[PDB]
Amino acid sequence: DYCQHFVDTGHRPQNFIRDVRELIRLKDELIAKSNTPPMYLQADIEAFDIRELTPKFDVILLEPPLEEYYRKCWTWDDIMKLEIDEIAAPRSFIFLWCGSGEGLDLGRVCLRKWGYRRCEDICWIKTNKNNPLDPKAVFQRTKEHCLMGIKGTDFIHANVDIDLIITEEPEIGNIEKPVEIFHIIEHFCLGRRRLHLFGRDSTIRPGWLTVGPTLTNSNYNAETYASYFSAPNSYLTGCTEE
Amino acid sequence: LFPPQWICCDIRYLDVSILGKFAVVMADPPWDIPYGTLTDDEMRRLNIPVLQDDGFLFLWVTGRAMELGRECLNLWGYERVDEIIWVKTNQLQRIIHWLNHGKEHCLVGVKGNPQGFNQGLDCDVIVAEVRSTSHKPDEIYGMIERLSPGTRKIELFGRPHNVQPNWITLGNQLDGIHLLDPDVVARFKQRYPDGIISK
Numbered sequence: 314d315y316c317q318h319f320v321d322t323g324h325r326p327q328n329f330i331r332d333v334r335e336l337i338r339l340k341d342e343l344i345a346k347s348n349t350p351p352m353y354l355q356a357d358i359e360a361f362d363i364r365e366l367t368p369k370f371d372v373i374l375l376e377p378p379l380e381e382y383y384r385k386c387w388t389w390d391d392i393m394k395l396e397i398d399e400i401a402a403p404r405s406f407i408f409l410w411c412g413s414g415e416g417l418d419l420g421r422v423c424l425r426k427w428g429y430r431r432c433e434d435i436c437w438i439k440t441n442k443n444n445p446l447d448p449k450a451v452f453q454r455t456k457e458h459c460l461m462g463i464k465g466t467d468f469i470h471a472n473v474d475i476d477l478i479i480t481e482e483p484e485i486g487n488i489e490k491p492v493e494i495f496h497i498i499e500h501f502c503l504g505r506r507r508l509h510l511f512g513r514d515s516t517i518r519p520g521w522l523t524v525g526p527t528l529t530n531s532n533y534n535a536e537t538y539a540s541y542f543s544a545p546n547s548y549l550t551g552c553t554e555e
Numbered sequence: 556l557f558p559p560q561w562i563c564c565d566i567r568y569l570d571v572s573i574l575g576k577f578a579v580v581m582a583d584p585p586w587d588i589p590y591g592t593l594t595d596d597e598m599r600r601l602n603i604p605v606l607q608d609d610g611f612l613f614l615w616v617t618g619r620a621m622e623l624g625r626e627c628l629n630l631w632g633y634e635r636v637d638e639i640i641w642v643k644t645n646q647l648q649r650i651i652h653w654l655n656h657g658k659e660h661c662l663v664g665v666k667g668n669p670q671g672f673n674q675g676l677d678c679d680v681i682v683a684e685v686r687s688t689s690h691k692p693d694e695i696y697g698m699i700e701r702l703s704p705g706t707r708k709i710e711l712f713g714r715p716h717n718v719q720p721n722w723i724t725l726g727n728q729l730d731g732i733h734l735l736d737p738d739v740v741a742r743f744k745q746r747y748p749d750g751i752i753s754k
């Protein structure tokens with residue numbers, strides 16, 4: 314009983330998960346080849362009209378800075394008023410980092426508000442191998458959820474990933490999410506128009522447009538960006554040859 | 556009365572008002588996502604609200620019941636204040652549509668203002684071995700006992716292996732009726748003087 318152990322020793326049960334030959338590396342190789350150059354834009358999203366972000370996106374990764382990450386923050390009031398449906402493609406995916414509190418409920422409201430249904434729930438399970446409190450909390454919270462949503466109505470790329478990410482709990486005040494979420498997303502081969510809202514200089518990445526208030530530089534040009542998906546490139550999965 | 560008790564019944568039809576109040580409710584419903592499943596309306600209509608005044612509810616959910624169970628939770632009068640994740644491993648501590656599923660979810664709801672519970676002793680991740688397809692991990696009962704020691708608890712849709720001390724277990728594949736608490740026995744005999752639960 315690892316629960317009983319955690320009560321006795323402070324080692325989270327997930328410290329005891331181990332190992333966390335079909336090589337899905339040509340996928341990652343094909344992704345790398347089709348990736349657009351990284352594009353990024355400093356923008357104060359509370360003051361910025363997201364409709365300027367074109368074309369519509371096949372994938373949106375939404376990482377609002379929640380108050381619970383710190384122990385400008387966005388409340389679920391602010392997040393729910395983002396017009397995400399105005400930039401999402403009719404068939405597209407969202408990945409929303411929800412924290413571990415009321416966000417598990419309000420994030421689902423958001424997804425429905427914006428026209429998606431939740432398809433998966435990706436749990437970021439944080440180990441404390443190197444270092445063995447909400448008022449409403451019944452339990453010590455040791456994980457965060459990233460909700461996957463689909464909207465709208467295969468290929469050669471199948472599912473290879475599990476819905477858990479296991480890493481060590483980062484140092485206090487480190488708000489970065491595990492880069493492994495980018496891998497789960499890119500492994501799907503969802504399309505090439507990928508947007509990361511509330512990204513940072515540290516999260517900029519090939520194949521993605523990053524938009525955030527703390528970016529120090531911008532290179533986004535709406536016409537240049539759209540040219541990466543012009544014919545005959547419009548409908549690629551991101552996982553096929555150039 | 557400390558030792559295990561159970562009632563073989565259709566939980567749709569049992570009059571649960573006879574059971575008293577419980578510090579903890581746990582339910583592992585047969586969501587309609589087959590054997591003896593309940594429709595969404597039947598789940599909504601279950602008389603959970605009479606089971607507690609102040610306490611916690613543990614609700615296992617998968618697939619679209621992740622949303623449906625949140626609805627039920629709120630309809631029955633609970634706020635979801637935690638969510639337990641059971642990471643599924645084999646005997647060697649390795650993890651067993653768009654993603655392969657390595658975990659199972661249990662919502663934690665609160666009703667009223669529970670007092671004297673040991674909140675924060677356990678964390679919200681369980682790591683435990685899979686057994687039969689239908690077998691929740693027995694670690695949940697220890698977390699619940701440490702959270703609320705000695706108090707009365709009730710399980711909905713349990714199976715014979717789930718009967719535990721301090722717990723009354725309900726389900727339609729239990730063996731008859733086994734009741735030991737004198738207050739429950741009295742109210743049961745009054746409600747069901749010929750020992751049959753219909754309609």
Ligand SMILES: CSc1cc(CN2CCC(C)(C)CC2)ccc1C(=O)NC[C@]1(O)CCCN(c2cc(NCc3ccccc3)ncn2)C1
Binds near residue numbers: 583615
């Ligand atoms: C429902 S528990 C369960 C949950 C799961 C899913 N989980 C497994 C553990 C988990 C951690 C993976 C998480 C997920 C799998 C199996 C059972 C199981 O084996 N359960 C015993 C059972 O007896 C069965 C018959 C219905 N059942 C009823 C049903 C009922 N009225 C409805 C009705 C009756 C007759 C006909 C039609 C409808 N009244 C009392 N009990 C309970």
Ligand SMILES: [Mg+2]
Binds near residue numbers: 322324445
């Ligand atoms: Mg230890």
Ligand SMILES: [Mg+2]
Binds near residue numbers: 432433652653656
């Ligand atoms: Mg799934």
Ligand SMILES: [Mg+2]
Binds near residue numbers: 341496500
């Ligand atoms: Mg990869």
Ligand SMILES: [Mg+2]
Binds near residue numbers: 693
């Ligand atoms: Mg067991």
